[PDB]
Design a protein around this ligand. Structure first.
Ligand SMILES: OC[C@H]1O[C@H](O[C@H]2[C@H](O)[C@@H](O)[C@@H](O[C@H]3[C@H](O)[C@@H](O)[C@H](O)O[C@@H]3CO)O[C@@H]2CO)[C@H](O)[C@@H](O)[C@@H]1O
Ligand SMILES: OC[C@H]1O[C@H](O[C@H]2[C@H](O)[C@@H](O)[C@@H](O[C@H]3[C@H](O)[C@@H](O)[C@H](O)O[C@@H]3CO)O[C@@H]2CO)[C@H](O)[C@@H](O)[C@@H]1O
Ligand SMILES: OC[C@H]1O[C@H](O[C@H]2[C@H](O)[C@@H](O)[C@@H](O[C@H]3[C@H](O)[C@@H](O)[C@H](O)O[C@@H]3CO)O[C@@H]2CO)[C@H](O)[C@@H](O)[C@@H]1O
Ligand SMILES: [Ca+2]
Ligand SMILES: [Ca+2]
Ligand SMILES: [Ca+2]
Ligand SMILES: [Ca+2]
Ligand SMILES: [Ca+2]
Ligand SMILES: [Ca+2]
Ligand SMILES: [Ca+2]
Ligand SMILES: [Ca+2]
Ligand SMILES: [Ca+2]
Lengths: 151, 151, 151
């Protein structure tokens, strides 16, 4: 009997937490975050070469932005447009030229390559950048692009 | 009766969440947010013209800062002072000159105008900025001011 | 006794909340915060003299970074390195020259002084800064250093 009362009490505490937290979710994502589905993109707000950008995301418990649908790509694009800086995606073809994969090693399930890309320009573009127009282009990993991680 | 040991686990989970959530709130608000009552003000840390600022807040799930009491205005003022950048409020008299209203449409229920304001200087001041001193002044919507949203 | 089904329900809500909270926490800390044990360090991203930095942290419900172990120091070093700006710690020897203490008055339980430090150079170094290499140096409280608070 006391348990039924203890349960109701917990119900009230949970409802409170749920409500308060929903508000802080909005506050937190402003202005550098974007929620799409169960994924959250967040930009560090600055540019870094691929290797450094990758380390920043992984050490933070996430990974570089990896849009796997038109919906996610559009969400990521909003951050890129807002910062007016193209960003690096997580995928590369460093292992096998022409074969882009996620950090897991799996093949792409979605892509939004600009016409003619990837073209491995100069024979040395193994990373991927997303333009403010939302399209993808393979680019030199040594370049510095906006750091956007996904969680 | 095993339900009793399960309730005990739940109680522990909720207390842990209450403690973690409270700590997280302080972290989030530092150093660009202010909690006042049920409202939360948060600055984007940069400036933008009115239209742009308004869009940013709306798309983020909130709206431009709309202080409705001396208490809210003081909370907002802290952010303005910290950043040393005057900010736009959500209110405007763009529809009917001389009559400032909220994004919703209702008339002002609180105001903290500087002496002599609003004066529609140049016959073209329909937006509202709040100075580091906390006072309000009607200013051209085309000017760039600190973006501060409320949630 | 559908209380067993009622407990099942809350079990699900609490776990759903635990998952969302864990995700938003990681997002929150990227890229200006660092979690170590139950402590959370977060930098404001800018510099301020000691008194102003201390006030910012206290007003935020926390205090200046106070590394109490090699683990916490390394965590704080990450933020300093990321911003490439030495930061102030909370400890000072203002009360009794030579004896550094925490805001509570307790003497240090951990230190990471650089060789030759602390030296009270010039006869007036009562604050402490942590370099990008993680070592400490007593420095004039009037200098402006990175603001990092702990919650
Ligand atoms: O530098 C190596 C890359 O060089 C070429 O890329 C050019 C595009 O050809 C050029 O049009 C422009 O791309 C912009 C695109 O037209 C625009 O719609 C979008 O919003 O932003 C893009 C980025 O500014 O500039 C890029 C170079 O930055 C080449 O096509 C590409 O394959 C090479 O990797
Ligand atoms: O530019 C159009 C506005 O021009 C006039 O505003 C001036 C004030 O007259 C001037 O004193 C100064 O206001 C500052 C105020 O005195 C100070 O206490 C506060 O902390 O900051 C204010 C902003 O710097 O500058 C403003 C212009 O920015 C005119 O009075 C106003 O109605 C016109 O809209
Ligand atoms: O200004 C008062 C301090 O002056 C002296 O400090 C110097 C060091 O002597 C100098 O080597 C350099 O320290 C750097 C340290 O060698 C390096 O490993 C670390 O990553 O960064 C340090 C800071 O750039 O600069 C400091 C001054 O900033 C004096 O030794 C010290 O006791 C005085 O307080
Ligand atoms: Ca290659
Ligand atoms: Ca390639
Ligand atoms: Ca290319
Ligand atoms: Ca008008
Ligand atoms: Ca007007
Ligand atoms: Ca005016
Ligand atoms: Ca002294
Ligand atoms: Ca001293
Ligand atoms: Ca010294």
């Amino acid at each position: 009997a006391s348990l039924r009362q203890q349960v109701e009490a917990l119900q009230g505490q949970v409802q409170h937490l749920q409500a308060a937290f929903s508000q802080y979710k909005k506050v937190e994502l402003f202005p550098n975050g974007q929620s799409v589905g169960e994924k959250i993109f967040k930009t560090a707000g600055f540019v870094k070469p691929f290797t450094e950008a990758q380390l920043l995301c992984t050490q933070a418990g996430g990974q570089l932005a990896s849009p796997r649908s038109a919906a996610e790509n559009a969400a990521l694009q909003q951050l890129v447009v807002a910062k007016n800086e193209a960003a690096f995606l997580s995928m590369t073809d460093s292992k096998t030229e022409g074969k882009f994969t996620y950090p897991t090693g799996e093949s792409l399930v979605y892509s939004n390559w600009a016409p003619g890309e990837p073209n491995d320009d100069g024979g040395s573009e193994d990373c991927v950048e997303i333009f403010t127009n939302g399209k993808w282009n393979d680019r030199a990993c040594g370049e510095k692009r906006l750091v956007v991680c996904e969680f």
